[PDB]
Design a protein around this ligand. Structure first.
Ligand SMILES: Nc1ncnc2c1ncn2[C@@H]1O[C@H](COP(=O)(O)OP(=O)(O)O)[C@@H](O)[C@H]1O
Ligand SMILES: Nc1ncnc2c1ncn2[C@@H]1O[C@H](COP(=O)(O)OP(=O)(O)O)[C@@H](O)[C@H]1O
Ligand SMILES: CC(=O)N[C@H]1[C@@H](O)[C@H](O)[C@@H](CO)O[C@@H]1O
Ligand SMILES: CC(=O)N[C@H]1[C@@H](O)[C@H](O)[C@@H](CO)O[C@@H]1O
Ligand SMILES: [Ca+2]
Ligand SMILES: [Ca+2]
Ligand SMILES: [Cl-]
Ligand SMILES: [Cl-]
Ligand SMILES: [Mg+2]
Ligand SMILES: [Mg+2]
Ligand SMILES: [Zn+2]
Ligand SMILES: [Zn+2]
Lengths: 308, 308
């Protein structure tokens, strides 16, 4: 059999389960909405993992374990989701290792989704071999992961690299975390979706050449000359850039990897903000867009593949 | 002889040279203004060190080496000041080890002043024994130092822990670093001095019970009910607090140490901002005011004392 992992990724919108090969190929991926309650969510994770495990046999893949990427603060040693922002409701003090390992008879690893993104970039991506790098993954929310001396920083209370909650305003838009002025509150998918929905509500988004509203609509409108959309995207990208400047002046990594579909749209503004505002000693920092399709899911697999 | 170090601290205002014992007692300290040019500055450092070395003999202290704390990005391995903001002009690509070691016939260590502050807190202060902690030192500028796994983080280009240049506004006041919205531009001594000088210019600082204007005047006025002074100090303290929140959500240290005379004035507002805005998983972070008189100078001594 192809040595493989089962990988789960639980984000602000979607719950995905995949069979991933030891080379980082996604063999098969199942996608559902992340349910809004604990009971539904745990049951769906189990269902999807059991079905994926059965298909793996039919696809001749030998599953070595299960890795779970999730939003929230996580204790990876104990496989417990400690605390989540409201992007995932009813997801506090949750033992994921026990129910999954009991159901599937497999070892189970769990980490925060940004930390998994970092692990993917270290194994399969542009972080391979590097002593220090940081990643920011834009999705519903913004996740972060920090590699220092080749290893993740988890922090004294497993809250390191909550990079979506870097604050770049004294005021600013409200964040789902309960704060305001967080980069996530400016630049996440959810933030852009809201701003697009607000413009579309006021008949102010659509422009000649387009016609369920989201971040990509705002970006399309901006390419097609919508002035309000361009301004929103500049503000968003500037905020993210300032988050990155904070990271540079804190950790001073050699490389920043931006991932998620919005990364390509933000990279130039992030580079410009660094150029215009960061200290000269961090100007040699490389800022790139990830070459991985799905860092969090790949990073969940990497925990199994490297540690089983 | 009492085993001792010579310690130099070069900040935004003052150049100090001290004889420091292996127990962290400042035996004797000399103070001058930090000159504004390279030639004057290097000559004064040398003068003051030669005089301090001669007095050490008369005080029966055996000097084991020289440690230098300086503002700027520093390569400690080579003893070179790489780049400085304009708080210290003409302080770029400067080899400090060679001229000092040639003049004094002593080994010489050099690091950034915030990194020295961290080293002092690790040896003599509230950081002793801790795997991870961060310090912010408020003076003319704001300096930072990060201990992770018991050791300083210097970063990939010696620009880690430039914590005064954490950005907490999309706009905000200009920073001497050339950016705007940096915590230093809100909350440093220089920032408060400027704001006090601005009020005093408009006859708006003095209040019944007081009568060369600086940060302590603004703070005195605020205690005595000056509404404009209280508001400025709240803004300043909120900005610093947000800097700290960024640190928590980046590194998630167990302890944050605030030092410099302004620390006592800011600690309650910093704690309040953390309370009101940071994630619940960092709420257990201890935030304290330093118990050391002069962390940078003590930390410069600690390099000699621990490594000679
Ligand atoms: N192709 C796309 N490009 C940009 N944003 C997208 C795309 N598809 C979904 N999104 C946005 O990203 C979020 C869903 O992305 P995903 O990475 O699946 O999120 P999560 O990990 O947060 O569940 C939503 O905000 C949605 O608008
Ligand atoms: N006792 C004090 N309390 C608060 N601020 C002070 C005090 N003495 C000096 N300052 C301020 O701090 C700066 C000088 O402090 P110092 O720690 O000697 O600075 P540096 O390391 O920046 O040379 C100036 O902004 C000055 O107004
Ligand atoms: C559920 C929750 O707390 N999510 C956080 C953070 O932990 C995630 O990494 C991030 C990206 O999904 O979203 C949010 O910022
Ligand atoms: C000269 C210079 O670049 N100083 C910086 C920083 O390096 C210092 O640590 C800080 C405190 O002195 O001031 C400034 O923020
Ligand atoms: Ca993270
Ligand atoms: Ca520093
Ligand atoms: Cl809700
Ligand atoms: Cl100048
Ligand atoms: Mg995801
Ligand atoms: Mg000083
Ligand atoms: Zn937030
Ligand atoms: Zn600055």
């Amino acid at each position: 059999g192809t040595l493989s992992a089962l990988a789960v990724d639980l984000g602000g919108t979607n719950l995905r389960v995949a069979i991933v090969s030891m080379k980082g190929e996604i063999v098969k991926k199942y996608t559902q909405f992340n349910p809004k309650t604990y009971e539904e969510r745990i049951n769906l994770i189990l269902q999807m993992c059991v079905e994926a495990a059965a298909e793996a046999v039919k696809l001749n893949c030998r599953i070595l374990g299960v890795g779970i990427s999730t939003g929230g603060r996580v204790n990876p040693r104990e496989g417990i989701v400690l605390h989540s922002t409201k992007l995932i409701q009813e997801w506090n003090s949750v033992d994921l290792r026990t129910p999954l390992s009991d159901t599937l008879h497999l070892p189970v690893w769990v980490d925060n989704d940004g930390n998994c993104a970092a692990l993917a970039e270290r194994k399969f991506g542009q972080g391979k071999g590097l002593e220090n790098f940081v990643t920011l993954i834009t999705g519903t929310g913004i996740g972060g992961g920090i590699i220092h001396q080749h290893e993740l920083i988890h922090g004294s209370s497993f809250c390191a690299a909550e990079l979506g909650h870097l604050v770049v305003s004294l005021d600013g838009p409200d964040c789902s975390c309960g704060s305001h002025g967080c980069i996530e509150a400016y630049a996440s998918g959810m933030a852009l979706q809201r701003e697009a929905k607000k413009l579309h509500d006021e008949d102010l988004l659509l422009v000649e050449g387009m016609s369920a509203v989201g971040a990509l609509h705002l970006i399309q409108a901006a390419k097609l000359g919508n002035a309000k959309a361009q301004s929103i995207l500049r503000t968003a990208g500037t905020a993210l850039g300032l988050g990155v400047v904070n990271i540079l002046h804190t950790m001073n990594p050699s490389l920043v990897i931006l991932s998620g579909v919005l990364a390509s749209h933000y990279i130039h503004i992030v580079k410009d903000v660094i150029r215009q505002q960061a200290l000269s000693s961090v100007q040699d920092v490389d800022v790139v867009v990830s070459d991985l399709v799905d860092p969090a899911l790949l990073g969940a697999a990497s925990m199994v593949l490297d540690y089983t």
